[PDB]
Symmetry: D2
Subunit: 480 residues, 4 copies
């Protein structure tokens, strides 16, 4: 039988018994202990929500879209088997997230294990495999008409893309539109965003959203270059632009909030300091570190936001340094935000260069009297890539549309056909600088270094530059 | 008289000072209950039943909130209760001048019915305001509550319509910031937008709006070029860009919906056909027409959306033609939307040229076989100016900011200091074409004329151009 | 073909072309000019909504429920024909409402035409026929597979009940009995009409309360009950059903029967009575009707809407001076004054036929207090309001069938004692409001004395403010 | 300066710097790790919210109400000092909650430490004292004009009541201030107002109390020789609705049958872990889950984390505790059998709760059964549902005023309002569950249960005729 669940975003949602079986596992229930926005909760107190409930939402919306396409276009031959596979992929696409979500894969792993190339998407696939095998799900899949060999492959492909011509093995070209629902590699328009827009806004207290219900009603499948793809109605093109504008707004105001990011940074530092001493038991009783738990799904299953509290509540002297950082978070003695700037023209900063940047800021030499002299280790420089999901490219150039007068005929719509008030660029970098020395004099010094460093590098003038560094800003003619 | 509490679905329970209640409980104000905020938009968005009355309450309330907030935070501004009430009254009364179907009346009907005259709802609001005050003995009531009618009436009118050197007489330069609350001529950031974003979204069914409560909390007054102005906190700049983006979204999706506009056009047409025959009694028993009721406020008081029904329910044979158009609206036999295009690059179309455009479309000679030949009178061409409120200018360039480290010091923030993902242009024109002949063949013909016309004029390729006019689009090399 | 409409309560809803044909008629579109809450708009400014949009909502929810039952239980043999008939009945159940909705049938007609018995439900049926016959809808119905003779009967029965046991309906047989429970549930009043108005009225009034109908639809099933197939609710929903009726009563108390909204309805009714001789409405064959006789000709009734209010207000004819003066008093907020509220004690119930005598009784009370002025029957208005759970003294939940998870096909009854001791022991009551047409201070004071004396004389409940408004009277009654 | 914070329920709220100092302490931040609804999150997935954000809301609303009263009635002499003390009490009233909130004081402590009498309210006062002393807050209070000796007493009194006019923190002329945060007279306070709105937002139930309306109509009047908060007469129906809503929310959410069983399972796991888990308190001294309430330094570190510490443990001593939590993750929960209520006169005492599983197991249904069940196979959960004041009507303990005499307080009786109101204001619900989840065990449990209801003259379970068609006929009253 169906289970009904009340979700505050989507209302009462029905879950097929197979989905319930997947949900009621330690691998899935784990998502209850991982905050969707990580350190954002420490800035937006409404953002208490966890990955668990977001995953239900994604699974539900995936089901909505595939059901809608099937109702409208029986000739697509969408089967219940297809519907369940799409729902399962929707449910399980977040399985791979670690403590504090993007902090873990965005900050901690890159620093702890630079050799490795690792993403929550890969984690989701591994967790999914572990979930299936640990809980005897394959037999249950067969009971409901699924074919595990093909369908597990199809599900993994929906999350992570080809495990590698038509590159997919889980389904053929005629069902290509199914791969656009959960995680859309072509243009990023998928049900994951649609849930998190609505859920995050509900919790953050921001009244913004994408109308996904409207979008689903106007979605159709058409042939595009000998593939069946999801097409949007021509009139939806402006709403799609708005969708990405919203996404960017949410990153600016919330996901990349300057303080939420510094808290993530502080937690990451604490995890690095604890990484040698914390042990997580995996398969065979055998022990992993925070940074190696990714190698064993049984261990990774037990790696959640709980680690934060394990460190905070520890008494072991080896963890004193890690614990001290978290204590500073509770007292709100955070690293201090100094300012924000951007690279000018086409200058872009490489990931490998990130390490050198604190050194560059400390090297600056402002022509101002300073009580204190700061060092590289006193500065944090956070570089944030902001885009429309596709680096420099416009995702709407990778969207196919149809018109009311010829619903089967797919078309392209260029930016110029829509509006001159749209963005001319679709990617940029933000640079935030913080100082670990929080006293008045240290902070004043840090401002001088920072603004001097912006000038030296011909970055943009910080918005408060004339107030925080009135002696420095006059030197740069461009600024005034 | 005592203070009144009223439950508004947008703002909750709001308190109204007895003076404001006296102004509200007049025929001149209550009239606004019978004018739809969005006019013909109700005929596309069925939730948009709301009238100008309740919007006016909201504007008055928010005007009060902002001025109170400024006073609390900065006593040195010397904001008085008298100032607060004047600002609230201007907020309440700013919409008094709207006519039937709001912007239809101002924007479409009067320009066509009385081209000699130059008329705006803003001017109407001032005239109505005067009429309201004098007809209802409000001046004595104003003095009772500490207002000085000569100065304060002038101040209120100036807030609505601008000046009738420091050009204002109602308040001096030290109180300049008060003129920025109700109708902000400098940059358009005022409480009117804040109420209509939230109210229209609530009714339309679209999730958006601007967080005005947040904005009020971060608003301050600072000296700018020897004037005291409202300044926003530096960190709010992105939210201000977002405010205008939202405004433009709402215009695109709702206020300029292609069908809501054609319904307004049809109603305008019916009013033109009824203008000779409908009589409205004004001062001294003198009779006016729909188009001349603007000259006498006693008459204009009785001119509301009711005239629509007076025409629809008429039996007089003189009104048969007007009545037939409205009947077509009820049967949904509307003029048919042919398409949309834009001028390319810097071309702009003047208001005086609008008349000639249907002639131009009818003069296009598409190289296609047509059964039927269309005439100028068969075409409607609607030209819509879409901007950020200041024609080609960026309103954020006319905003002053302050930073946390020096709250009294105003600064400027340029677009390059905020984001490269912002618009490079801030005004554009949309051109919609419709046809009054609704049969299949007439419509097909209209499409060919339209696309040919776009090509001839080097306008943008209509989004569905290749589908509606496959023979025409190939000729233009630019289009493909 | 399908139309999509954005409703702020339900989101994007699809309408089948047949329903669109019904909607795009003067008989339907008329509902755009009738306020859902009538005079309530004059108390809650958000309540600008009209019967039109509510009707779309009812039609949509009727569809949702019937679709849900069909998905879950294919063995019911629900056909698309069934679905459309249920939707049409949902759309059309409000067609019979007159100006200001319940004012018209609840106040005006009873007073203008006491000989006649008339209800909006009967109006809806008559309007429905008129709509079908005037617009050639029967052929269109046949085109989509409907059988007009049966189906029109079925639709009318859904609105108004049987047109004259064991099975009293002709439009559908006992096996389809559950379909008659969707639009207007005569058995217990649990239907989609309430579900829409709770959510819509709350959204507009600014009250957060509503009933979770989407939850209810998910738990609804059809079971055999006494050889009929009926809708049954899950046992666990019984408390939510009690809550549904509590919400209904809350809404009546706070809004639909707000003391001032009611007095405004009363004033408008008085104005209509005074205009009834002079206003003419053209019906079939050019024949002329009055406001009170337009109910006899649907062509005339089609043109009878809230517009009449403004026609009276804006009139210059001296015959209409008295009517017009009443409406003018409404605009100035010079209303009949609320004196107080009381209830009958224990057994006592007051009949509609007695309503005329009550003002006489109040005027006959002889308070032992010094009075400057002496009041007459004609100076008093006594409004008696019946508040119940939809079924006079009866508990509607006693007329609900439930099922349990362990035997889903087995219908059961649940008594009040099986649910809670905190529920109501009675399900009907009366409120008595008294108002005075003389608004001066001395007249009002006198009215209060008559009123409280009258309450004491009749052993009604002590008005809440009784000791404040009549400190000399309340001591005489020992109980109080 | 003021901090501004965006709360999804209240919007942008300003926090005075003193309140920020109190918030940015381990004692306060601890509330981030305690779910407001405990096991309810396991039934309503939207209910992720913690006590922390609820406490911000309560503090804000406390400020709103006191500010409103001050604006409207300057003659009350409400000072900024008064405002801050009321806000602090609002912020800090939830400080004393333990893991999974009401589970801890409602289920676990009573079972683990029956000799002790403990409430989260007492915990809040103890935590508050610990917070102040540990973080040097007293000097900061004086900096902003507070007088710690009087004002700390006043704050504690607001949370827990008195430690003649029985209060020492403020005099009788300021008595209305004690009605804002935790209203002992009738329960109408800002704590409910926040949790109604916040819980509804998260649970997905569009129900609520309009507290903004209420605040606008609230006034202080003399009642007896006390200054009290009085509501406008017209708000009486809203106040009845407020308690109806409260009871609705308890029925649908806070006492959800499955949420309660999960709380019961977690409590059981804690009891099994209580001997083995150690929490370091003051002086390096070690405490147990059940004794951490004696030392605030230890209690500071006692949060929902303990659930995961047990779940992730490898120690064999914790196997039994860990197994129970593992069953929760697999959703192998004890099964709900049914619900019943005592009839007429009858009420069940707390001391009798233990015996009830024995009584159910002792019922002898006249039906053929494959399996025989034992006392230990049954859980019987007895829930007292009321309007906050046992049998009493809280509206009888509310004072009102009318628009014609705003300074004259009055009473409004139930009969003056409506005959559709409740005639009783307290009742008991009895839920029975079975630890044996198989088909045959279930079927047996249902027979025992319904027989037991019959034997005890309890109400007929709603599905009684379906689950026990052989049993229900014997009882004439039922049919
Ligand atoms: C009882 C109830 C539950 N809910 C929510 C909580 C859950 O997320 C979801 C399902 O809860 P329930 O409907 O209570 O489902 P259940 O599994 O507890 O009962 P059973 O298996 O006997 O049918 O609905 C409400 O929103 N409102 C309510 O009134
Ligand atoms: C009674 C009531 C009114 N309202 C709304 C309707 C109105 O817009 C607003 C004020 O209505 P009321 O509070 O009814 O005020 P009133 O002027 O009718 O009564 P009095 O003059 O005696 O104080 O509040 C609610 O939102 N909830 C309620 O429970
Ligand atoms: C354009 C648009 C419309 N709406 C609403 C307004 C209407 O109620 C509903 C239908 O609007 P449209 O989708 O614009 O439908 P249409 O009939 O105008 O277009 P076409 O016939 O070419 O398909 O959608 C939105 O909610 N958001 C939007 O962006
Ligand atoms: C930036 C931003 C924050 N918020 C929320 C997040 C926080 O809860 C709250 C405060 O955030 P900020 O206003 O960013 O406060 P801050 O302390 O980071 O900035 P500063 O100290 O420089 O003044 O507002 C929004 O709602 N919208 C926004 O656009
Ligand atoms: Mg009033």
């Amino acid at each position: 039988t169906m289970k009904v669940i009340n979700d505050p975003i989507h209302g009462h949602i029905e879950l097929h018994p197979l989905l319930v079986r997947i949900i009621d596992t330690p691998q899935f229930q784990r998502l209850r202990y991982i905050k969707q926005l990580g350190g954002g909760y420490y800035v937006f107190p409404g953002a208490s929500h966890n990955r668990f409930e977001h995953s239900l939402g994604v699974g539900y919306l995936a089901g909505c879209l595939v059901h809608a396409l099937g109702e409208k276009q029986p000739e697509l031959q969408i089967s219940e088997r297809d519907v369940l596979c799409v729902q399962i992929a929707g449910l399980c696409r977040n399985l791979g997230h670690g403590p504090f979500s993007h902090m873990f894969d965005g900050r901690f792993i890159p620093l702890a294990r630079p050799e490795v190339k690792w993403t929550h998407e890969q984690g989701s696939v591994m967790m999914f495999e572990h979930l299936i095998n640990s809980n005897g799900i394959k037999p249950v899949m067969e009971q409901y008409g699924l074919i595990p060999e093909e369908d597990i492959c199809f599900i993994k492909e929906q999350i992570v893309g080809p495990l590698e011509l038509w590159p997919y093995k889980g389904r053929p070209e005629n069902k290509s539109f199914l791969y656009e629902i959960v995680s859309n590699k072509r243009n990023g328009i998928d049900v994951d965003k649609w849930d998190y827009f609505a859920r995050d806004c509900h919790h953050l207290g921001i009244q913004n959203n994408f109308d996904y219900k409207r979008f689903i009603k106007f979605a159709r499948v058409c042939e595009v270059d000998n593939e069946l793809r999801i097409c949007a109605r021509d009139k939806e093109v402006g709403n799609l632009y708005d969708m990405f504008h919203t996404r960017n707004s949410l990153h600016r105001r919330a996901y990349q909030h300057k303080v939420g990011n510094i808290i993530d940074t502080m937690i990451t530092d604490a995890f690095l300091k604890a990484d040698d001493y914390i042990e997580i038991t995996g398969a065979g009783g055998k022990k992993y570190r925070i940074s190696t738990a990714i190698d064993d799904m049984e261990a990774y299953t037990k790696l959640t936001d709980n680690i934060f509290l394990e460190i905070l509540y520890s008494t072991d002297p080896k963890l004193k340094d890690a614990r001290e950082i978290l204590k500073q978070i509770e007292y709100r003695n955070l690293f201090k935000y100094v300012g924000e700037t951007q690279p000018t023209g086409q200058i872009k900063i490489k990931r490998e260069d990130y390490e050198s940047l604190p050194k560059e800021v400390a090297s600056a030499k402002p022509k101002v009297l300073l009580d204190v002299k700061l060092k590289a280790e006193d500065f944090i420089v956070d570089v944030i890539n902001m885009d429309y999901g596709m680096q420099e490219k416009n995702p709407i150039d990778h969207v196919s549309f149809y018109c009311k007068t010829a619903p089967n005929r797919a078309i392209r719509i260029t930016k110029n056909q829509v509006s001159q008030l749209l963005p001319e660029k679709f990617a940029e970098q933000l640079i935030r600088v913080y100082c670990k020395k929080v006293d008045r004099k240290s902070l004043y010094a840090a401002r001088q270094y920072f603004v001097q460093w912006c000038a030296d590098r011909n970055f943009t003038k910080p918005q408060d530059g004339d107030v925080i560094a009135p002696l420095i800003t006059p030197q740069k003619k461009e600024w005034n």
